[PDB]
Amino acid sequence: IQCSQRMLSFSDALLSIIATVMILPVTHTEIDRSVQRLLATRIAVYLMTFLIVTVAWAAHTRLFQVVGKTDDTLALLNLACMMTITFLPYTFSLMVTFPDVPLGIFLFCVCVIAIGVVQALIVGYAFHFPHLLSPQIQEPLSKERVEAFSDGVYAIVATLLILDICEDNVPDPKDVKERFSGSLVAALSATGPRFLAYFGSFATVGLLWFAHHSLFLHVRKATRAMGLLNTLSLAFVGGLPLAYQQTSAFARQPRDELERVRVSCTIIFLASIFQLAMWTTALLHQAETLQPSVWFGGREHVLMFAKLALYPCASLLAFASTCLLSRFSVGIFHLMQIAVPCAFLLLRLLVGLALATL
Amino acid sequence: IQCSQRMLSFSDALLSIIATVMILPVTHTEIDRSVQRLLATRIAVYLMTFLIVTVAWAAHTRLFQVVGKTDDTLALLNLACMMTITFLPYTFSLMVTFPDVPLGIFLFCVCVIAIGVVQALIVGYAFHFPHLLSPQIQEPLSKERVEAFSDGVYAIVATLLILDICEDNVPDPKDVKERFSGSLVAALSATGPRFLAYFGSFATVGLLWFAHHSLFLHVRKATRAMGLLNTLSLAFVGGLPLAYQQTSAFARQPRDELERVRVSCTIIFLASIFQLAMWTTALLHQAETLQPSVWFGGREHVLMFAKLALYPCASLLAFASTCLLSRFSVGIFHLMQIAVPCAFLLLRLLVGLALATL
Numbered sequence: 001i002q003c004s005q006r007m008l009s010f011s012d013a014l015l016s017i018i019a020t021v022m023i024l025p026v027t028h029t030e031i032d033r034s035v036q037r038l039l040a041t042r043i044a045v046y047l048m049t050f051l052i053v054t055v056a057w058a059a060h061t062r063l064f065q066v067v068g069k070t071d072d073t074l075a076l077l078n079l080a081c082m083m084t085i086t087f088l089p090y091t092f093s094l095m096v097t098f099p100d101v102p103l104g105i106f107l108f109c110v111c112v113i114a115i116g117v118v119q120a121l122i123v124g125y126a127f128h129f130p131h132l133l134s135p136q137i138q139e140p141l142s143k144e145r146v147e148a149f150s151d152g153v154y155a156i157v158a159t160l161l162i163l164d165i166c167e168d169n170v171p172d173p174k175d176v177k178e179r180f181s182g183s184l185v186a187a188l189s190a191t192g193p194r195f196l197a198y199f200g201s202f203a204t205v206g207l208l209w210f211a212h213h214s215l216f217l218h219v220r221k222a223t224r225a226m227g228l229l230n231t232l233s234l235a236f237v238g239g240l241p242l243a244y245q246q247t248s249a250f251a252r253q254p255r256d257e258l259e260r261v262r263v264s265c266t267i268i269f270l271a272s273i274f275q276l277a278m279w280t281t282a283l284l285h286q287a288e289t290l291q292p293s294v295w296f297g298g299r300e301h302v303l304m305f306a307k308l309a310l311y312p313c314a315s316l317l318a319f320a321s322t323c324l325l326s327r328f329s330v331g332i333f334h335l336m337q338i339a340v341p342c343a344f345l346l347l348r349l350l351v352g353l354a355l356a357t358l
Numbered sequence: 359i360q361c362s363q364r365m366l367s368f369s370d371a372l373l374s375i376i377a378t379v380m381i382l383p384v385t386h387t388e389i390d391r392s393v394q395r396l397l398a399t400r401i402a403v404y405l406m407t408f409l410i411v412t413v414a415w416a417a418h419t420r421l422f423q424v425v426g427k428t429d430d431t432l433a434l435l436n437l438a439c440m441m442t443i444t445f446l447p448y449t450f451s452l453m454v455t456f457p458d459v460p461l462g463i464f465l466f467c468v469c470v471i472a473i474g475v476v477q478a479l480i481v482g483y484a485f486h487f488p489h490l491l492s493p494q495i496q497e498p499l500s501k502e503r504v505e506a507f508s509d510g511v512y513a514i515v516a517t518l519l520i521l522d523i524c525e526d527n528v529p530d531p532k533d534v535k536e537r538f539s540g541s542l543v544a545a546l547s548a549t550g551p552r553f554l555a556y557f558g559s560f561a562t563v564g565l566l567w568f569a570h571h572s573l574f575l576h577v578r579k580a581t582r583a584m585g586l587l588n589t590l591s592l593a594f595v596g597g598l599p600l601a602y603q604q605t606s607a608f609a610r611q612p613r614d615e616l617e618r619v620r621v622s623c624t625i626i627f628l629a630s631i632f633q634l635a636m637w638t639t640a641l642l643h644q645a646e647t648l649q650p651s652v653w654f655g656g657r658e659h660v661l662m663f664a665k666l667a668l669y670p671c672a673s674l675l676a677f678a679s680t681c682l683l684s685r686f687s688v689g690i691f692h693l694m695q696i697a698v699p700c701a702f703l704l705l706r707l708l709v710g711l712a713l714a715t716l
């Protein structure tokens with residue numbers, strides 16, 4: 001018998017890697033009609049493979065909620081399960097790209113059966129040894145597994161763009177001599193747009209997590225509904241690097257710039273509206289879901305509501321500005337990107353002043 | 359005040375992603391003298407940046423051992439620190455690639471100073487509010503931080519090859535029609551060498567984690583020496599995806615097959631020998647570093663040593679057979695790969711049989 005905490009922590013460390021695998025082809029597309037069609041299908045494949053893996057992760061979370069502890073043999077079998085799930089993103093992509101060929105669906109079916117067989121072995125082993133079962137066995141989701149998966153997914157998504165910078169955007173000496181007259185600074189400057197995208201992408205996904213971090217500190221017990229929205233929250237957060245990378249790219253006409261800013265704001269709203277939904281959904285059954293410091297009329301109630309609702313409000317103002325002003329919108333988008341971090345920093349005083357004003 | 363357990367775990371998720379960033383160029387190198395020189399420098403940079411980032415991570419662990427708890431302001435500041443450290447891999451690569459130009463060294467000095475001031479702010483903020491410091495203040499490394507970083511590193515390292523397969527090696531419908539006569543099976547079969555690389559890489563990297571996980575469950579209190587040896591163990595584990603990719607590559611002459619097996623066996627020995635070194639180092643101060651269940655003469659003592667010493671001992675035989683046999687060497691390596699997982703599965707039975715014989 002062994003404590004299962006770490007074995008699972010590693011388990012979600014792999015899944016977050018696998019779930020977000022298909023985002024990499026999305027962000028690596030190079031910038032028209034054919035590109036748009038290609039970009040759409042890549043995005044569609046990403047969302048599908050994210051949910052499929054998430055269901056497999058969900059089954060694992062439930063499966064190991066029964067097996068309270070772990071031993072040497074189960075750890076080996078657990079690895080075989082994870083080794084089995086790592087094929088879903090590839091197998092699915094083959095299936096969609098090849099709907100006519102029956103081989104594609106067969107591989108997809110084989111993989112799903114393989115995951116089931118390994119899990120069937122895992123549960124069988126546990127029953128054969130009652131001391132490996134949870135005391136209850138000897139709806140709610142485990143909170144740690146939701147936390148650990150979320151932390152991973154954000155870390156990959158936050159740092160996607162830099163990994164591309166560290167690899168493909170390191171100047172090569174020969175080009176420096178030829179196309180930059182031997183000036184290193186010029187070579188770095190030509191890469192400046194790509195560096196701004198990373199700064200914005202990290203700041204957004206860096207703060208979106210901060211709202212998530214403070215939300216789940218006061219959550220007593222997650223629920224299936226909260227987990228499902230959380231999955232939808234993270235699914236869209238994966239598109240943020242794509243959004244920012246598009247915004248910083250050169251625009252031939254002002255209409256091109258406006259359209260991209262509309263696209264970028266849409267994903268930020270979708271990513272953070274569901275975090276607000278989780279708060280509201282918890283409020284419905286707050287008696288059994290949240291700490292008593294965030295109940296209706298509680299001390300932190302007003303603070304938490306604002307903290308989650310800032311991005312939904314900020315994004316709508318940016319989107320509304322695009323529709324109405326049509327000329328200062330780009331400045332507002334950049335201005336808000338610099339203002340939102342300040343609002344998060346001064347949230348305590350800002351809300352207190354507002355309460356006095358009201 | 360807030361519990362920092364989740365906040366730190368996120369920082370270790372970011373750092374593990376950052377430390378092993380430079381391994382991606384290493385494994386993307388395509389297969390002669392120039393390539394050897396190009397491959398050597400890439401491996402040299404990867405080893406350096408891993409040590410630099412781990413040095414940054416080591417400071418982070420010590421810093422936040424003084425900041426016991428956290429609140430809203432600290433969480434934002436911690437994010438600032440991560441934003442700064444995510445540039446060390448890129449800035450260092452710029453410095454090395456351009457030793458002559460003084461700009462590169464200036465950026466590296468700037469980035470390092472940036473981390474210093476941000477940490478200076480955090481320590482200053484905590485001292486301003488005594489209640490946010492640890493009770494002791496208001497050498498040993500925190501165990502959880504060592505595990506979280508280690509689990510991340512194995513997760514990225516284990517799945518490195520698959521993320522490349524899901525992205526680069528999905529058959530092209532037009533190519534299948536042209537270069538494979540429209541037979542999907544032919545296209546997938548041409549990909550077979552790449553898949554066998556992933557099978558071994560996951561198992562070898564996967565089973566190394568299982569040995570690592572078993573060790574760190576029985577350790578009371580990590581130590582600086584253990585942390586340093588752990589860092590070296592992870593640094594070489596990053597080379598396993600490279601090793602198995604080379605072995606599976608087509609060989610023009612048998613001597614090439616022999617050379618690749620020597621390198622592949624070497625990396626496994628270096629990766630696993632240091633995990634044995636951690637065990638040996640801990641035993642020196644067993645009274646204050648390990649469970650009594652793994653002391654000299656303990657119930658599990660013999661079992662643990664076999665589990666860690668399996669790969670170091672198994673690897674030498676694969677290398678030894680290379681020099682002596684020279685014709686069954688390649689066969690032995692393949693058989694050994696299918697043999698070690700069985701030995702790990704049946705370790706408890708195998709050790710019992712050996713004890714009875716002795």
Ligand SMILES: Nc1ccnc(-c2cccc(-c3cc(N)ccn3)c2)c1
Pocket residue numbers: 024028160163164167382386518521522526
């Ligand atoms: N977060 C990760 C994990 C693993 N790999 C990457 C990555 C980064 C940059 C480029 C490529 C790439 C590799 C190719 N062989 C072909 C085309 N792009 C992969 C990112």
